[PDB]
């Protein structure tokens, strides 16, 4: 769980409190302040399957 | 080094949408956009004061940052934010100034100069010099050491700091101890563009099309391309300018433009240090605390300022 600290609505990238998330990771947009559930992608961590 | 991993993630998503239509992009359109940079960590300082600086014909907002644990008389940096002479303000660069103050051990005055196309060239240049003069003449009121006042800035703001140093040389003051130029746009002969202008023209946030768009907004005509208040590298006599520190980024179209200014300063007998940050792009200071490479690099730039004004 976390909350979207910032997300660019037009370009589809952002950060979740921090871990990166882009629009393809969402299951179209996130907005600042939302609470989400995601997997970590530590292949600078990144989010996956964001709810 | 390869691209910093966090920056890489941003760029990969940025470059999925096509480039803007620069022939019809308006400034009011571009400013209505959401900015590419998110708000980043604000380092703590002793005090931040915002006020209006009254100049003939216009008022400029100023933010003054006093860091913890420094005693008067203070060294100071007059700082001009970047943004292609069209965007940016005190808040977009507030986290940058806080790092420069806290780790540079200096009072920072961040100056809100007038923006194009509403105020075309040379409005920002006049603002940049007139604001330095306003502050330097009040050094005693601000408890500053008049022998340790620097100028600095990023991107278009580094342009303004470099040009301000030239105007101060011409006008016999005020005394500038140091110029801190962070990936600055100091110009070049348009017939011989430095390699990075074409090598890094696409893919790294600041693009060749964006650069031409900023210039069209800022300048009255392209005949001003070689005016030294726009391209200070072409100023005929750079001797006697303040010593400089120049930071460039490896993946910046302006990388070899900064290198060209260092070469020109060095050949005119001015002390200059230049450092290229091999893993970063243009504008990396605004990724502070978010990108580990950007964080390390901005802290190093701030320590260069500290050493210069010690």
């Amino acid at each position: 769980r976390g909350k979207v600290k910032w997300f660019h609505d037009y370009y589809g990238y952002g950060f979740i409190t921090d871990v990166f998330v882009n629009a393809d990771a969402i299951d179209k947009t996130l907005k600042e302040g939302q609470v989400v559930e995601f997997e970590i992608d530590s292949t600078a961590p990144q989010a996956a399957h964001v709810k | 080094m390869p691209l910093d991993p966090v920056i890489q993630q941003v760029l990969d998503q940025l470059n999925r949408m096509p480039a803007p239509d620069y022939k019809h992009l308006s400034a009011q359109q571009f400013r209505s956009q959401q900015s590419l940079f998110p708000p980043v960590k604000k380092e703590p300082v002793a005090e931040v004061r915002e006020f209006d600086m009254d100049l003939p014909g216009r008022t400029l907002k100023v933010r003054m940052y006093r860091p913890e644990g420094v005693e008067p008389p203070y060294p100071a940096l007059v700082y001009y934010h970047g943004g292609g002479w069209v965007v940016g303000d005190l808040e977009t660069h507030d986290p940058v100034c806080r790092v420069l103050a806290k780790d540079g051990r200096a009072v920072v005055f961040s100056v809100d100069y007038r923006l194009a196309p509403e105020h075309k060239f040379p409005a920002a240049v006049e603002d940049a010099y007139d604001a330095l003069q306003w502050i330097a003449e009040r050094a005693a009121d601000f408890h500053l050491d008049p022998a340790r006042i620097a100028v600095g800035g990023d991107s278009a703001g580094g342009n303004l700091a470099a040009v301000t140093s030239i105007l101060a040389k011409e006008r016999g003051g005020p005394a500038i101890a140091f110029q801190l130029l962070i990936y600055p746009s100091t110009g070049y002969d348009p017939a011989h563009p430095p390699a990075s202008i074409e090598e890094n023209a696409e893919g790294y946030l600041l693009t060749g099309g964006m650069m031409l768009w900023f210039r069209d907004q800022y300048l009255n005509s392209l005949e001003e391309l070689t005016h030294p208040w726009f391209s200070p590298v072409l100023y005929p006599d750079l001797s006697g300018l303040p010593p400089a520190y120049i930071a460039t980024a490896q993946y910046d179209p302006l990388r070899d433009v900064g290198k060209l200014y260092a070469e020109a300063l060095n050949k005119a007998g001015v002390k200059v240090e230049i450092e290229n940050f091999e893993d970063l792009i243009h504008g990396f200071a605004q990724f502070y605390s978010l990108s580990p490479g950007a964080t390390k690099a901005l802290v190093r730039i701030a320590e260069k300022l500290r050493d210069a004004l010690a």
Side-chain angles (χ1 to χ4, degrees), chain B residues 141-173:
Chain B
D141 287 340
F142 284 120
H143 313 295
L144 314 178
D145 182 349
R148 296 193 289 152
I149 298 181
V151 298
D154 64 291
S155 188
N159 169 272
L160 293 175
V163 171
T164 294
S165 300
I166 287 171
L167 287 189
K169 182 190 146 168
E170 290 183 342
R171 300 167 188 193

Side-chain angles (χ1 to χ4, degrees), chain A residues 5-13 15 18 20-24 41 44-46, chain B residues 5-6 9-10 13-18 20 33-39 287 290:
Chain A
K5 176 183 268 147
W6 182 88
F7 191 83
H8 203 271
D9 204 63
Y10 170 77
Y11 276 113
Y13 69 93
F15 300 87
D18 284 8
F20 182 88
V21 50
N22 58 31
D24 281 359
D41 192 331
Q46 168 154 24
Chain B
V6 187
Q9 296 172 323
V10 174
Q13 188 56 30
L14 264 166
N15 296 332
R16 296 196 190 313
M17 300 297 308
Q33 300 195 342
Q34 199 194 348
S35 172
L36 313 172
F37 312 88
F287 284 111
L290 230 43

Side-chain angles (χ1 to χ4, degrees), chain B residues 194-250:
Chain B
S196 61
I197 287 288
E198 294 174 34
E199 181 187 29
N200 296 333
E202 299 299 326
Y204 302 109
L205 202 158
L206 182 66
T207 65
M210 188 95 269
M211 290 181 59
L212 291 157
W213 182 87
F214 284 137
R215 197 191 66 177
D216 289 347
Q217 302 298 311
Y218 183 45
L219 296 185
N220 302 291
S221 86
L222 288 194
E223 261 90 4
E224 286 173 340
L225 275 186
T226 58
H227 192 300
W229 292 13
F230 175 64
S231 300
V233 78
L234 303 176
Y235 186 69
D237 183 17
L238 301 166
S239 67
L241 286 173
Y245 172 85
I246 297 163
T248 66
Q250 171 67 10

Side-chain angles (χ1 to χ4, degrees), chain A residues 1-49:
Chain A
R1 64 86 208 151
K3 71 158 47 184
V4 198
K5 176 183 268 147
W6 182 88
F7 191 83
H8 203 271
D9 204 63
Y10 170 77
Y11 276 113
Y13 69 93
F15 300 87
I16 277 162
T17 323
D18 284 8
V19 186
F20 182 88
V21 50
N22 58 31
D24 281 359
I26 310 167
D27 287 332
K28 197 105 192 263
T29 188
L30 289 176
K31 214 210 151 285
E32 193 279 289
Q34 267 158 249
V35 61
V36 305
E37 192 155 294
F38 53 85
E39 310 175 20
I40 297 316
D41 192 331
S42 292
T43 297
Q46 168 154 24
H49 307 90

Side-chain angles (χ1 to χ4, degrees), chain B residues 111-141:
Chain B
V111 172
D112 230 17
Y113 55 91
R114 285 168 304 168
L115 300 172
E118 292 84 5
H119 309 279
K120 281 201 179 257
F121 172 85
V125 169
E126 295 289 337
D127 289 349
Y129 177 84
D130 289 350
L132 166 71
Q133 179 180 61
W134 190 96
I135 292 162
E137 291 179 353
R138 289 163 181 79
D141 287 340

